[PDB]
Structure 1
């Protein structure tokens, strides 16, 4: 038996782990003995599995299968349906859930030492991703998972793209739902995505962490306040571009160490080439952890 080949009729629904546009993730027991002793796994599937969606999903699956890192969720295998060949991605189950939910739950009971451990791990997962010339395009605390108190992993790759051989950016021609409040300026203006725009987004994740996911302080809430809550639809993007151009930025989170705030603001450079590298961010964060401890 090839253990990466999962028979769908043996997957028992336990609970839903998340849903949105395109897909959902469910906690399931893979229980071929049918006695409730099988392994519990995470199962990602498509809500709307059109030809185009399935094509993208299969690339996503290949991306995840190609990544082996302590801070990247583990690929376990796939399901194929008969006939139209619907696909399910089977992953390890990380029982503490998303980092967004975890931090929202425990708040300041997670101390700065812990937050920086998570930061370093996110940085390392991202640096590793970049070595494979993959661009994540969706880095947010909702996409990061908690294995245990001491380890987080990047948990979703639904928007991940491979760079063209001869280019250092990927251009999206027809944008779908876009997490615009995590986007670099050049992603908003030109739909250009690169390691450097992933670094911009990482700065936003660092902000999320240090606000402890306080809803009033969320990137959407803050940017909307800065451009005006009256702005709607496409005018949000117009005003956001103008704001960023003029160095409008998320504020320093309350109680945030200065060295950490400085990292955020460096990630949020309008000049793409001046943004730090993930290799350097991981070094810098580990040094800060070292100084604290």
Structure 2
């Protein structure tokens, strides 16, 4: 589903060399977010292979794609627009207005997304509040798929990604959510956080996080990947708590 240029560009709303993100409209009708590339930022093949897989993946909790622009000019990906920006950003402002029953619902949205990605054998090498989008009333959707404060030990060292590495990250994101968007290990060095985690230190439990939520957070943070629950499991565990909580 290729887009020629039926795209109107409005404002810059995101960046990182691999292109910027603009708020646009497709056909003067649909509000969209357009991710352009740069120049020699991504091989044509890299971006093509990436777009295809992204278009292969679809879940209610992942950001939806409208199409791609290979029709020249900066190459780009047209996503649906998320009316509330990125979670992290939403969690920081709005701080003090969240009910625990609301923050957990958020975590559950990213978990459903992540369960889907997990089964699809996809690894989100950078799961964090900054890559989650808020839209249709609180609904959280994961994006930027297809930062050692979020890396599991196996990543720190061997750079061994996996589905479990994601869960570890998910754990940090939960901390992020429940702390209403605070910086994990803020006052600390990368070549310092590794020290603490390696000894058994874990992010402190946020006030809004109940001991039961914290428990799961600590299960995502087990040293061994195999000791961590799959997202498929995290989802059901989070559900129970939420249900009763």
Deviation digits for residues 1-46 of structure 1, max 9, x if unmatched?
A: xxx32122x3222222211232221110123xxxxx4222111111
Q: Confirm or deny that 1:65 pairs with 2:30.
A: no
| Distance 1:180-1:48 versus aligned 2 partners, 3 A rule | farther
* Matched residue, 2:30: 39
Task: State how far apart, in whole Å, the 2-side matches of 1:140 and 1:22 are.
Answer: 18
Deviation at 1:265, TM superposition (A): 1.1
Deviation at 1:116, TM superposition (A): 1.1
SS at match of 1:76: strand
Mapping for residues 6-17 of structure 1, pairs under 5 Å: 6-8=3-5, 10-17=6-13
Q: Confirm or deny that 1:56 pairs with 2:46.
A: yes
Task: State how far apart, in whole Å, the 1-side matches of 2:64 and 2:178 are.
Answer: 27
Q: Confirm or deny that 1:250 pairs with 2:238.
A: no
* Matched residue, 1:176: none
Mapping for residues 169-188 of structure 1, pairs under 5 Å: 179-188=147-156
Mapping for residues 142-221 of structure 1, pairs under 5 Å: 142-157=130-145, 160=146, 179-214=147-182, 218-221=183-186
- Would the aligned equivalents of 1:15 and 1:27 in 2 still touch at CA under 8 Å? yes
Q: TM-score, normalised by structure 2?
A: 0.93
SS at match of 2:92: helix
* Matched residue, 1:25: 21
Task: State how far apart, in whole Å, the 1-side matches of 2:61 and 2:209 are.
Answer: 24
- Would the aligned equivalents of 1:49 and 1:86 in 2 still touch at CA under 8 Å? no
Task: State how far apart, in whole Å, the 2-side matches of 1:255 and 1:121 are.
Answer: 18
Q: Which moved more, 1:132-141 or 1:55-64?
A: 55-64
* Matched residue, 2:220: 267
- Give 5+ residue unaligned stretches, structure 2: none
Deviation digits for residues 164-188 of structure 1, max 9, x if unmatched?
A: xxxxxxxxxxxxxxx1110001101
* Matched residue, 1:76: 66
Q: Identify which of structures 1 and 2 has the higher relative contact order when contacts are C-alpha pairs closer than 8 Å and 6+ apart.
A: 2
Deviation at 1:203, TM superposition (A): 0.2
The CA RMSD over aligned residues, in Å, is: 1.8
SS at match of 2:69: strand
Deviation digits for residues 70-109 of structure 1, max 9, x if unmatched?
A: 0011111110144xx8521111111111111111121121
Task: State how far apart, in whole Å, the 2-side matches of 1:150 and 1:256 are.
Answer: 18
| Distance 1:149-1:38 versus aligned 2 partners, 3 A rule | closer
Task: State how far apart, in whole Å, the 1-side matches of 2:170 and 2:60 are.
Answer: 18
Task: State how far apart, in whole Å, the 1-side matches of 2:186 and 2:198 are.
Answer: 19
Task: State how far apart, in whole Å, the 2-side matches of 1:220 and 1:79 are.
Answer: 40
Task: State how far apart, in whole Å, the 1-side matches of 2:214 and 2:198 are.
Answer: 20
In terms of Rg, which structure is larger?
1
Q: TM-score, normalised by structure 1?
A: 0.78
